[PDB]
Swiss-Prot record, chain A:
SUPFAM superfamilies: (Trans)glycosidases. It catalyses: Transfers a segment of a (1->4)-alpha-D-glucan to a new position in an acceptor, which may be glucose or a (1->4)-alpha-D-glucan. Coiled coil: none annotated. The keyword Transit peptide applies. Keywords: Amyloplast, Carbohydrate metabolism, Chloroplast, Glycosyltransferase, Plastid, Transferase, Transit peptide. It is an enzyme of class 2 (transferase). Disruption phenotype: Increased amounts of maltotriose and leaf starch. The keyword Glycosyltransferase applies. GO terms for cellular component: amyloplast; chloroplast. This is 4-alpha-glucanotransferase DPE1, chloroplastic/amyloplastic. GO terms for biological process: glucose metabolic process; maltose catabolic process; starch catabolic process. Pfam families: Glyco_hydro_77 (PF02446). Belongs to the disproportionating enzyme family.
Swiss-Prot record, chain B:
GO terms for molecular function: 4-alpha-glucanotransferase activity. It catalyses: Transfers a segment of a (1->4)-alpha-D-glucan to a new position in an acceptor, which may be glucose or a (1->4)-alpha-D-glucan. It comes from the Eukaryota. It comes from Arabidopsis thaliana (Mouse-ear cress). GO terms for biological process: glucose metabolic process; maltose catabolic process; starch catabolic process. This is 4-alpha-glucanotransferase DPE1, chloroplastic/amyloplastic.
């Protein structure tokens, strides 16, 4: 105590940085974008080569979009199921390594500069099915793992429903489950038993395909972990109407007596559309969900825990307040803001799954409740440099207004590439940006913005692969409020991870400089 | 209620920035550096002109060094008293406004490119005395304010002791109070009464001089406030042995039975000296101070409150642990006592050097901001805390302090490894404007407050350096060149304002 002598080497009693505060960087790249011969990226060789490339840069995070079966436009954010994997990500070459295909069965390569889901489906699906058929017919080690997977209660609580939904959908010629006969529509037990008898093989194959996705995704994840790379997944806030999630959990969505949505999702007039984004997903009956401690949402997060080290929460503002549009409407601009579940949801998640690493996508209309909700759960938010040059110096996306507990992006999958953005940028905004940023040639504008993200105080900086490749507007992943021509971008067939040492070295130099290695 | 509609105005329910988080900037400039004819800067017209200039830039903070009577080398950090003002900062022209001098009594101007304290003393002190004499001899409104000042208990708790110490020091031919005869050394009551009778005039004049400093300083401070400018002072953690503070409060310092120290202050081998800085000040008996709720330190802060909006604490680490030529400091117990006695304070911790865990924890526990200095940022790796990407919000960023060379001076002698680093991190145009590159980097920081020495705004070299640590001669002398007026710095003002606008510090 006060006045007395210290021990010796008091001089070596120095502050030790907290390992959870470690500065880092990463790349945003959806696996559909990998090059290869089967019309779409997959969880095979290119994923592992990408991980190796990423590791060589010093980056320690890979962010993907939702891995759910996408809508027919390719959107991960209107998925056909909330928990299933997109089976067209399954690598045929990896099935050959597993003994479920032979090399001779692999199709002839097709050129596909961009992903066409219908072309990839026709090519891959017969061989995926044939591999699943060999799996369920076999009686050894892999079959034994299939059975563990399917009897595991944290799988079967969603996978059984998904497989029955898919089987009924295969049985019926109908637009959606709204049109289904009453016993199937409302999941009468003897109807489900009848479906099990008449569709037994389809059900066993669907389940086998989910196992194969799981298996291959987990190999990619462990390989990333072996190379010092965390994977950040993405949890879309809404699911599509035509899904097992809505059909099997009707009471938990805002549907009428006949199962039709009263209200659908979106946002009011914004940057991307002067009539708003009319997403058109069904909405959650949050009060009903509260009555069984949000178990559907809890199950979702438990699933995400199993796939990802960390998870982005899409449209995070929607848990404080959400935009609700009448279901008959043709534009989002007529609508009401409604009260979200708030912290009560995250308390339920904590109680059910324990410790989670979540990233709030807090972009959009950010009201006081949104900020307070984010702070109350300790989650980092986002900054996007492409938004930084409207308004004045109080713009939160400007570097000097960044926070430590935050993730900085050059842009997301919703934004144009940096070059594309620069190219159409308003002159007032462009002249601003020239003052803040360190710009050499306009060819390398993407690198100027990348450097600005890396120089930030934000703990994590994430760059889309398109910007590392210096690509233009044609490489944009998604344009919000458009219905066609999205989610198709692929790494050009000529660009290999072997041909990107210059880019790797340049990233590593910037990470070294800004203490992100 | 979950599920319900929100009210109509929901989209406009936007976060309002917290006013206590407001980003700002300022200038470090000691008043001795102002131009003028009397051999030293003062609290007259240049201080007001500087405030007006500073306001036009968008800056909202002015940082000074300690305003105490300095040592004979000019150092504010080995002051002759912890609470008195440096009377050579008194403006003679302001005394003429007050009726205490006439214009005809003012001395002929002397050219002094730098402050010489002996030259300034010989010039100014006789007239300051003559003014103080006219004050104490007068009746009327100014005399009435002198009496209020001296009877105010938050003045007299330090000023009485300071005036008696100075009177005895004037009476005696002695090295220090250690050599004083016992009754004066040890403040025997009948000795102090005797001194009051035999030095009454000196004592009244000393007090009058402190009133005139207070008066002029408070006008400067109220003018700054009217122009939106906060003043940040500074205090050394230690005071010199030969001071009223030690002599009148012996029990509170680490002295033997005869009043001699035993333990003195400093810190080990560092950047500025391979044998360390041996400051040699006496040290606090912290346990004894705890026994009267740290009243000496509390009085000190109360005085700093009176002079400054905010205050830097030099060698803040010394409150967690101090080197005695390592011992346990008083820690948070001291700041709790300050809070209880004075209420809310705005303190800035000088947390520079090799600092230990307890220092960081202490600083965080009282909510005080620490420092980043850009001149230190380019040694070691990317974990260097002075690099912008490692700055914190609750922090004060400097290009450099009064202890560092100017940016141009620093750039000029900089090690090549460090220089090549700095070129990668900073935005540099011409080397002539290296000071502006570093100023821009400070302004772009996430740190809430950025402070730039006036020398760097003027783009000056090593000859304008204020102080070289561990040197005994040639410090504290810099003055703004006689040709540079605040009227003639519009380009510099505009450039600062453009940067503050850009980085949200207006
Ligand atoms: C996209 C993001 O939008 C919101 O934030 C925006 C904000 O609105 C902007 O103003 C701006 O804000 C910034 C300011 O501009 C700036 O000044 C400063 O202040 O900073 C602000 C940032 O804070 O930028 C932000 C961010 O981009 C949201 O708040 C934000 O959460 C959101 N991003 C994520 C959320 C979703 C929603 O799940 C994702 O949406 C995407 O997926 C949708 C669903 O697929 C898609 O909808 C389109 O496509 C549908 C088909 O898939 C289509 O559906 C119809 O047609 C189908 C057949 O064709 C049929 O089956 C359906 O039944 C039909 O309804 C929809 O009509 C169509 O809209 C979205 O377009 C797509 O973006 C995001 O990807 C997430 O990242
Ligand atoms: C933060 O605080 C430090 C506190 O020292 C500031 O340091 C500056 O001011 C110091 C003086 O107050 C300088 O110390 C040097 O000069 C001292 C005397 O001025 C030296 O002390 C020795 O010499 C004096 C003669 O005046 C003797 O009377 C003393 O007994 C004897 O110890 C001292 O050794 C020497 O280091 C220092 O260089 C300055 O940097 C600092 O500026 C603040 O930021
Ligand atoms: O009077 C000057 C101050 O002296 C003490 O702090 C000094 C250090 O002694 C000195 O080593 C140097 O430290 C910096 C170091 O050079 C740099 O590599 C490192 O990254 O940062 C250090 C700063 O935190 O400079 C400081 C500050 O001038 C003393 O502690 C202080 O009270 C005095 O004001």
């Amino acid at each position: 105590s006060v006045g007395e002598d210290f021990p010796s080497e008091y001089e070596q009693w120095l502050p030790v940085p907290d390992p959870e505060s470690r500065r880092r960087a990463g790349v945003l790249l959806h696996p559909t974008s990998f090059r290869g011969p089967h019309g779409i990226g997959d969880l095979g060789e290119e994923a592992f080569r990408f991980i190796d490339w990423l590791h060589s840069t010093g980056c320690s995070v890979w962010q993907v979009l939702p891995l759910v079966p996408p809508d027919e436009g390719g959107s991960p954010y209107a998925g056909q199921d909330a928990n299933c994997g997109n089976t067209l990500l399954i690598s045929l070459d990896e099935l050959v390594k597993d003994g479920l295909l032979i090399k001779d069965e692999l199709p002839q390569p097709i050129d596909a500069d961009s992903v066409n889901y219908q072309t990839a489906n026709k090519l891959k699906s017969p061989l995926i099915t044939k591999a699943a058929k060999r799996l369920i017919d076999g009686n050894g080690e892999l079959k034994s793992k299939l059975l563990d997977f399917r009897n595991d209660p944290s799988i079967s609580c969603w996978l059984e429903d998904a497989a029955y939904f898919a089987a009924i959908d295969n049985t019926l010629n109908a637009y959606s489950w709204f049109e289904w006969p009453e016993p199937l529509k409302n999941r009468h037990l003897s109807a489900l038993e009848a479906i099990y008898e008449s569709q037994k093989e389809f059900i066993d194959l669907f389940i086998a395909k989910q196992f194969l996705f799981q298996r291959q995704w987990q190999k990619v994840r462990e390989y990333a972990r072996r190379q010092g790379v965390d994977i950040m997944g993405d949890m879309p806030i809404y699911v599509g109407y035509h899904s097992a999630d809505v059909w099997a959990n009707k009471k938990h969505f805002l549907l009428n007596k006949k199962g039709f949505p009263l209200l659908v999702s979106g946002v009011p007039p914004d940057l991307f559309s002067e009539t708003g984004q009319l997403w058109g997903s069904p909405l959650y009956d949050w009060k009903a969900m509260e009555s069984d401690q949000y178990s559907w949402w809890v199950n979702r997060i438990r699933r995400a825990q199993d796939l990802y080290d960390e998870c982005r929460i899409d449209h995070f503002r929607g848990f404080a307040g959400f935009w609700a549009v009448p279901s008959e409407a043709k534009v989002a601009m007529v609508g009401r803001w409604k009260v979200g579940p708030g912290k009560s949801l995250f308390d339920a998640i904590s109680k059910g799954v324990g410790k989670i690493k979540i990233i709030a996508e807090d972009l959009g209309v950010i009201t006081k409740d949104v900020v307070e909700l984010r702070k109350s759960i300790g989650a980092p938010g986002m900054a996007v440099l492409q938004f930084a040059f409207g308004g004045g110096a109080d713009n939160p996306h400007l570097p000097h207004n960044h926070e430590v507990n935050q993730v900085v992006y050059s842009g997301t999958h919703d934004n144009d590439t940096i070059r594309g953005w620069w190219d159409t940028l308003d002159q007032e905004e462009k002249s601003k940006a020239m003052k803040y940023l360190s710009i050499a040639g306009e060819d390398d504008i993407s690198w100027s913005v990348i450097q600005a993200a890396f120089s930030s105080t934000a703990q994590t900086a994430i760059i889309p692969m398109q910007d590392i490749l210096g690509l233009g507007s044609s490489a944009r992943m998604n344009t919000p409020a458009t219905e066609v021509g999205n989610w198709g971008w692929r790494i050009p067939s000529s660009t290999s991870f072997d041909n990107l040492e210059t880019e790797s070295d340049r990233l590593r130099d910037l990470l070294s400089l800004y203490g992100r290695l």
